[PDB]
Amino acid sequence: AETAKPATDATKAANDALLKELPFDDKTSFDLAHKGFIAPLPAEPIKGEKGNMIWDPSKYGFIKEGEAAPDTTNPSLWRQSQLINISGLFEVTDGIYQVRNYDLSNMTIVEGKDGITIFDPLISQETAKAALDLYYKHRPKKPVVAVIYTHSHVDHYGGVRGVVDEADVKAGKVKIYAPLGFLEHAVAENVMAGTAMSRRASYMYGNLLPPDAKGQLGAGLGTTTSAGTVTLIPPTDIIKETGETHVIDGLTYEFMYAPGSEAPAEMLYYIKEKKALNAAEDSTHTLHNTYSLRGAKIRDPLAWSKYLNEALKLWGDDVQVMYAMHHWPVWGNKEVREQLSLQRDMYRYINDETLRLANKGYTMTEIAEQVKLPKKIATKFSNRGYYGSLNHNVKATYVLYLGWFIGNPATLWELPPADKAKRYVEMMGGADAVLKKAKEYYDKGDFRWVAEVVNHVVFAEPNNQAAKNMQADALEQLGYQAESGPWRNFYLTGAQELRNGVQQLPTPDTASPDTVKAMDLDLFFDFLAMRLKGPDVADKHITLNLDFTDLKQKYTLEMVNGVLNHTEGMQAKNADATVTLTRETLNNVMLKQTTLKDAESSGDIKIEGDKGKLEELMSYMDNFDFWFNIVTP
């Protein structure tokens, strides 16, 4: 089995060119990333109760500040990887602390009148607990009086039970603040397309790669994701509009409601006494994703720009420090305004130039080839595509406005990848001839082309290892050149799977107990409907009446024409069966705590009518192999 190759001369030249374009002599990022350092993270890796690795703080130890970029790494991404590994407890300003790099995200702690308020308690309960214990090792041991979730992604709420006990939330001693839409979007994320998204995420975050100079370097936005217990306590206080002001633990918070920017539900806020702005995840030290390669709904760069502009309008004159839920802070009114201004301009440029070029008749990939950020934006390291990339953001923006079809009817009804591949290979003279021609292009450094054309040989002949080896070599050079962590990881993971095959592993975790319980029945029934093997059951008809005795809510589920419909507040006259149960019992079955059959046996699920129909319906539900092929058919 083939292994990683050296960087080609073409790769070295491409990376070296970046040294002239970017000001690597400027070390400002490092000063800011080290500023306010209090204490390092514990060296001991965090392990779960079951012995699983949750967080290894030395994972990317090979990446050291002061060490030159290996020639198999983009030097800008190497610089960023050094920066994101600067870890520990930091002071941002008087009374505001952050723990950085104990997870993908930062945890923030604000000292108020009587206690502390926690922002965005990481992905895992275990990392959040460790981050809070670190804070308490150095700062006074005062109670948590409030938690804020800045937005609806898992790395900003997942560890909540590690910092607060829900008994205190219920008793009114601790309030949890979140933007309008938080709960619905947090819970629904990774449900409907969860297997596709998580398998794609295994490429994105480089989880399958070795951490080394020819492997993964980190995700640009943070190093990687923890792998512990995801928890969720529903918020008690909802922020619904910008201008909203609340006193929390004696400090005055003014909010900006920012839906549809980086996340569906998101908010930024200013603490007036500290002249300190929380930019959430809308301004960090990278160009971010207006579209994530993991696979997600495409975001609106214009809305994002306008939120940054509104932040300037509201706080620009007064702000003294800006911090965010990833990366390090920026200090000084002038400096804060510059970051906000350049990033505002950057997201607007993506929007407006994509639209202008589309109105001129350019199509998706042509527009992405042309759009280049102005020098004043592009020469700041904070605006480089370490997580997002300009190219895939621009493509996504064309799709946001005009969809997938580029208008040329030659592209309306193309054959699928494996089918077109066979025809391409045939017309180019066969697999051997394609590889020989592709080699010439490779030696000229045209790896973008080699990766496209050799992909046809692979999809036509997936057992051709010579083809897979060459495709891997091409992807790998592109990986070596990639400034985006996610780009590098997609390329290098593709190369690895082509050389070695897909490694057979456990499906990872699926849905946390808290997440499942917070899921409304509408979402649950849509998820079951997604799993239905429609073509297998198109001629069949099952109607079930469900009665949830605790909720006093009734539903009709109707499997008909190969789909599963649901309706709240109805009961069918002619149902095959009536199913009576509590919501708790349903959660128990979905969390695989009891089987459907045992729930029926025990009487927790009572059935009137055809006793077999619920089991029958469930027997038509698909199951997904997590490790589906990506770089081969």
Next chain:
Amino acid sequence: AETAKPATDATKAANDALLKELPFDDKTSFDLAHKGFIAPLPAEPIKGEKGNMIWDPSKYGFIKEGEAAPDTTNPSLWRQSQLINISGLFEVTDGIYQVRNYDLSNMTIVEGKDGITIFDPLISQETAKAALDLYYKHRPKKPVVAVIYTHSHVDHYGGVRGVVDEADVKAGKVKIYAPLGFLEHAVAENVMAGTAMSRRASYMYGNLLPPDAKGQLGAGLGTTTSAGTVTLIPPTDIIKETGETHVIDGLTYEFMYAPGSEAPAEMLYYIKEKKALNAAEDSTHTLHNTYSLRGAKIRDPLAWSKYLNEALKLWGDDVQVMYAMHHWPVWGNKEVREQLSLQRDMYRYINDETLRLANKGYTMTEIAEQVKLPKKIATKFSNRGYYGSLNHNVKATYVLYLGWFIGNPATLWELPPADKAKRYVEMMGGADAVLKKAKEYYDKGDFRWVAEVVNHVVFAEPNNQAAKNMQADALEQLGYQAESGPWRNFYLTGAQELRNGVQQLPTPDTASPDTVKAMDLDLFFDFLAMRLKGPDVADKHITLNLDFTDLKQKYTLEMVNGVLNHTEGMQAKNADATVTLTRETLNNVMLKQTTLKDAESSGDIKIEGDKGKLEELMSYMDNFDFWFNIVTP
């Protein structure tokens, strides 16, 4: 120039195979389309002042009921084309009338206590006026007391000035009802990606083609769009929620708010006293567009399915007739329930099967190749893809959840069309070799392949007329096979432009006066920003303070880093200029009814400071040529 070819044997076989799958002996569609006929449309074509054609009622006269489908037409689309040409004034039920095929859409008239209420007054004021005149020739001359726009597309409001005088709306004599988000979306649709959308629409609606058996047949949803004066009066009353009920002219309307279905702003409603359901454009006698090839944001088929399911829940037991804003009604409670139920199932099937296959690892085009509607749905003519197609809807649904990128990094950074074209052609032995090889595939009927591969020769060598001729022949055979009107039109227009070149004809110089007047300043300034030639002005900086005296509002415009930002409620300190004006004055400059220089000279635009900086900003704005290339670079 080459011209249209006969149908090949492969095309005849593909079309003939459809006769075995669909019940062509069922004439229900025709019975329903003829039911309630009162009077025909006037035979004389509607012409504008310059004798421009606005509406020719004989345009598709060659398509006659009872006449066999020509072998260059899909027999299912031929059937639908006969149906949509059934024209005139019709009674739906007591007090509800429609005028059908005086435009792409229907106009509906409902008789109430004291007057009439008009729904969806067509595209052009001239067709809407003629439609109302026809009604008034056969029913009592009673005043219009209300207008309803069911959704935010131009064929459902554009002729409004033909049915009501805006003076009567201002007087409070006529109310105009619309769904929440109507005005924002209607104006944005006309404006932001307007050149791209309008040029793509020239393909979609077959406007450039001759109406004959080898040319355009109609759009499936309706014949074609009128070409008269597009107008807009902003609504007075906004429907925000599904519970919502209003008594309009002595009749009770119960509304369903249906955002993100066929349009971003859409509503359905039931008139209680008449047991009559208006399905807007969410249930018609075609599979519709969850994504429009014209270019638009992708829609949510799950939401669409759920709206149809909710209509069943709310009105299913009571409803006696359902009508819509395109096509003909369905009568009878059983029959209405069946159409709603089958279409509900169809849109859910598209959503759920796409997700399930994506979760199994299938990618966009692979999924679209596999998904096939179940027999009970697919064998009803009302569910065939005459406007939408299952294939492009399924592709869009993948993109809705997962975006443009299919996960395989070989496709992450492809070369643009012209650049990859050159390389494909080189590796296939040159243009002549490709054309000779492609002919073999063509003769085997593999037109989907020929259209993809010969497209490379065209993009590599745009002046190669032999290549363009072969590409045209392949597209044309696909056009002859298409069941979707928009598909047929895209294919046949592409063929025509390849054979003949792009034929330029007069198009509008600006947006309509009513469109511009309805635009809010946020949109106005975003549209200017889109036009900014960023790369040309990246190093320049212009700041303008605006004061709108009629509004009592101030703005700052800032051109910086190649973008144009705007901020409401701010004035910058050392601005280049302060500009004082009214919205009317600003609109006239955009509409080219006045000149900026003259508006300044006359005193309508008062400027302090650098009086030429506004002129300078305008000089940097791009202009768009409508007739951009689609089938050649």
